Amino acid sequence: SHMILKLKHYNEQQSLYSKAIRWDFVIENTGNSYIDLRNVKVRYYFKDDYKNINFAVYFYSLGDEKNDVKGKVYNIRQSDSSHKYLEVTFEKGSIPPGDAAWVFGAITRDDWTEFNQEDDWSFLQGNSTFSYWDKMTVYISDKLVWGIEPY
Amino acid sequence: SHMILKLKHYNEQQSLYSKAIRWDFVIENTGNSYIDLRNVKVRYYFKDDYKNINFAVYFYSLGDEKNDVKGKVYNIRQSDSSHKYLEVTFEKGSIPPGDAAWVFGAITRDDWTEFNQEDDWSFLQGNSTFSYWDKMTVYISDKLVWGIEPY
Ligand SMILES: [Ca+2]
Ligand SMILES: [Ca+2]
Ligand SMILES: [Cl-]
Ligand SMILES: [Cl-]
Ligand SMILES: [Cl-]
Ligand SMILES: [Cl-]
Ligand SMILES: [Cl-]
Ligand SMILES: [Cl-]
């Protein structure tokens, strides 16, 4: 009958126009068993029409940034092309009860032109550190366990 | 790109064993247009195996408690019988931007025997007034717009 995880987010780029979108999050384990991140997806929703987005992981507290944390951008439907999410997944990682996974990184357009973050569902302004944020979502084996999908 | 509603809940019965479960909630309108409650469902998740549950509305800030606010209990699946939700719906009601709908009431077993709230997903303890509560859900035309379903 208990939730066993919560998510916090902090976005270092709070200007509306930015070359990088920061999806940094912390998944907190609030239950009594380990959480297997191999079954966990996290989504950052954004609106943008540039096809070639690059994904960079700057920090992963539970493993190797290059090898263990993966990112891919998906369209929400065939139409319209601009409504997307980045989905972050893990090849390895286990969150101890009472602990948290810290995962920091960015996405950028391959041509280094700027995003307009103003219309991005997951965009968080006005805070100065990691805060619970219900506009990014978390799934465990494809069940939605945290957050609100765009509507 | 914005959420337009949030939910707060307060449960006046915080004893684990209780003859009444209080589902009281406030839906806040955080956007710029009216919210039509005719398209809104709110769910309180609980585990209980008594078939005949009665629903009482004590306060509805936007209309008539008897006629305008409706409640029905549903099973989450055929199996297991005990995992349920109360769904609250509205025949009438429109939340002004910047305002909130207050909706207080209870469910009871028709035989007046006690619930055990300890295993109820939506059960909230340790608070002294209405607080944002992400273990009750809200839907607008069947899209989930607030909260986390049991998992
Ligand atoms: Ca955008
Ligand atoms: Ca129960
Ligand atoms: Cl909980
Ligand atoms: Cl916070
Ligand atoms: Cl949604
Ligand atoms: Cl928002
Ligand atoms: Cl609160
Ligand atoms: Cl769920």
Side-chain angles (χ1 to χ4, degrees):
Chain A
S1 76
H2 301 295
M3 289 167 52
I4 52 67
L5 80 68
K6 303 188 175 171
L7 175 147
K8 297 184 173 182
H9 164 57
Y10 178 52
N11 202 326
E12 292 83 3
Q13 309 281 346
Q14 284 187 19
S15 288
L16 293 196
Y17 295 96
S18 174
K19 289 186 187 189
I21 284 173
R22 297 286 300 275
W23 44 262
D24 299 14
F25 60 89
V26 180
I27 299 174
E28 299 191 324
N29 182 344
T30 57
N32 308 313
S33 61
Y34 284 74
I35 289 171
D36 188 353
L37 289 182
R38 290 176 305 166
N39 297 325
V40 169
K41 289 170 189 193
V42 181
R43 291 177 186 176
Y44 185 99
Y45 297 91
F46 68 101
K47 185 176 188 296
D48 191 74
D49 243 342
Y50 193 75
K51 173 67 55 210
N52 192 359
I53 299 300
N54 293 331
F55 171 75
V57 179
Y58 298 146
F59 187 74
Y60 176 32
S61 62
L62 300 173
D64 183 69
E65 288 70 22
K66 312 176 135 182
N67 293 320
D68 299 344
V69 181
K70 302 300 192 187
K72 182 171 182 13
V73 170
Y74 296 87
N75 272 85
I76 291 172
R77 327 269 173 220
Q78 304 168 8
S79 247
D80 80 345
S81 62
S82 69
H83 290 89
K84 288 173 182 175
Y85 53 89
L86 165 72
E87 185 165 272
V88 178
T89 52
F90 301 87
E91 301 275 25
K92 191 217 71 155
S94 182
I95 316 182
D99 211 334
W102 297 65
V103 200
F104 303 173
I107 54 174
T108 51
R109 296 180 168 188
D110 188 66
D111 68 356
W112 292 103
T113 61
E114 283 180 331
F115 297 107
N116 171 13
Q117 302 196 82
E118 193 177 30
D119 53 10
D120 294 348
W121 182 261
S122 292
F123 179 52
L124 175 49
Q125 279 186 303
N127 65 337
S128 65
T129 192
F130 281 87
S131 299
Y132 292 117
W133 184 217
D134 53 17
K135 299 184 80 193
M136 288 174 63
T137 48
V138 187
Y139 306 76
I140 296 170
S141 302
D142 301 312
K143 208 170 328 179
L144 173 60
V145 299
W146 174 270
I148 302 163
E149 300 178 320
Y151 65 89
Chain B
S1 76
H2 301 295
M3 289 167 52
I4 52 67
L5 80 68
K6 303 188 175 171
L7 175 147
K8 297 184 173 182
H9 164 57
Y10 178 52
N11 202 326
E12 292 83 3
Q13 309 281 346
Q14 284 187 19
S15 288
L16 293 196
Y17 295 96
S18 174
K19 289 186 187 189
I21 284 173
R22 297 286 300 275
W23 44 262
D24 299 14
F25 60 89
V26 180
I27 299 174
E28 299 191 324
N29 182 344
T30 57
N32 308 313
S33 61
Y34 284 75
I35 289 171
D36 188 353
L37 289 182
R38 290 176 305 166
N39 297 325
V40 169
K41 289 170 189 193
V42 181
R43 291 177 186 176
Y44 185 99
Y45 297 91
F46 68 101
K47 185 176 188 296
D48 191 74
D49 243 342
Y50 193 75
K51 173 67 55 210
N52 192 359
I53 299 300
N54 293 331
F55 171 75
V57 179
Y58 298 146
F59 187 74
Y60 176 32
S61 62
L62 300 173
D64 183 69
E65 288 70 22
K66 312 176 135 182
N67 293 320
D68 299 344
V69 181
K70 302 300 192 187
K72 182 171 182 13
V73 170
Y74 296 87
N75 272 85
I76 291 172
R77 327 269 173 220
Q78 304 168 8
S79 247
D80 80 345
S81 62
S82 69
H83 290 89
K84 288 173 182 175
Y85 53 89
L86 165 72
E87 185 165 272
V88 178
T89 52
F90 301 87
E91 301 275 25
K92 191 217 71 155
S94 182
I95 316 182
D99 211 334
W102 297 65
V103 200
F104 303 173
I107 54 174
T108 51
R109 296 180 168 188
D110 188 66
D111 68 356
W112 292 103
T113 61
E114 283 180 331
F115 297 107
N116 171 13
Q117 302 196 82
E118 193 177 30
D119 53 10
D120 294 348
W121 182 261
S122 292
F123 179 52
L124 175 49
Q125 279 186 303
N127 65 337
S128 65
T129 192
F130 281 87
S131 299
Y132 292 117
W133 184 217
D134 53 17
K135 299 184 80 193
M136 288 174 63
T137 48
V138 187
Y139 306 76
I140 296 170
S141 302
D142 301 312
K143 208 170 328 179
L144 173 60
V145 299
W146 174 270
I148 302 163
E149 300 178 320
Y151 65 89

